[PDB]
Structure 1
């Protein structure tokens, strides 16, 4: 059950990282357009229940990705985000509380990639 939860986090993390790579190889001036789209971060992210703040931000995430023409990505935005949605559902087993600051898409991915890495460490 803790070995199971840890593996789901391992997969969730794969997805986040996969997206973040697509985005750091957006060698298109259009990147400015993308980074202007603002994402909401969680006030605190210390427990699985806090993945709520990731669930609620997935629609805006999928949208922003769709703007970047497909040629640029190895994955399909709607797919990689459905995927992430599924994991988050199985991992939170509450109401979300947001930080006052917004962040670019890249900072947002980082915050969560980190969060995943933390939990995974403490579960080892």
Structure 2
């Protein structure tokens, strides 16, 4: 049961890294524009239930990805992430006051994933 949970988080980790790596390969003027979009960050993210904070931001994530343009369709990878987040989290999300770019948003959730995987090894 703990192994199944770990596997899901690892798939989530790799999905998120995929988006970040895809974004990091955008051309600089396009990327500059993409970094103007605001993403909302959890006040605290240490537990699986805090993934609610990720779930709520998945639609804006999908939109920004759609607005940029690839071998992957945004609706497919976001759907995969959605399924995993929904099955993992199984509470109202508390948001931090300061917003973030798509990059720092992705970095934060990548770090969350890696932190939780580390408690399951």
User: What TM-score does the superposition give when structure 2 sets the normalisation length?
Assistant: 0.96
Which position in structure 2 is the counterpart of 1:40?
A: 40
- Contact 1:22–1:74 (Cα < 8 Å) also in 2: no
Q: Which runs of 4+ in 1 moved over 4 A?
A: none
Aligned residue pair count? 121
Q: Tell me the distance in 2 between the aligned counterparts of 1:34 and 1:74.
A: 19
Gap regions ≥5 residues in structure 2: none
RMSD: 1.0
Alpha-carbon deviation of 1:122?
A: 1.1
Q: Secondary structure at the match of 2:63?
A: helix
Q: CA deviation at 1:28?
A: 4.2
Q: What residue number does 1:93 align with?
A: 90
Q: Which residue of 2 aligns with 1:123?
A: 120
| Cα distance in 2 for residues equivalent to 1:110 and 1:75 | 20
Q: Work out the CA distance in 2 between the residues paired with 1:85 and 1:7.
A: 15
Preserved contact between residue 62 and residue 77 of structure 1 (Cα < 8 Å): yes
* Residue of structure 2 in register with 1:30 after alignment: 30
Q: CA deviation at 1:75?
A: 2.0
The question of 1:105 aligning with 2:102 is answered yes
Mapped partners of 1:28, 1:103: distance in 2? 18
Separation of aligned partners in 2, 1:62 and 1:118: 24
1:7-40 alpha-carbon deviations (Å, 9 max, x no partner): 0001011100100010000024111111000000
Matches of 1:73 and 1:17 in 2, distance apart?
Answer: 16
Deviations 1:52-90 (A, max 9, x none): 00000000000000111xxx5442111110110000001
Structure 1: unaligned runs, 5 residues or longer = none
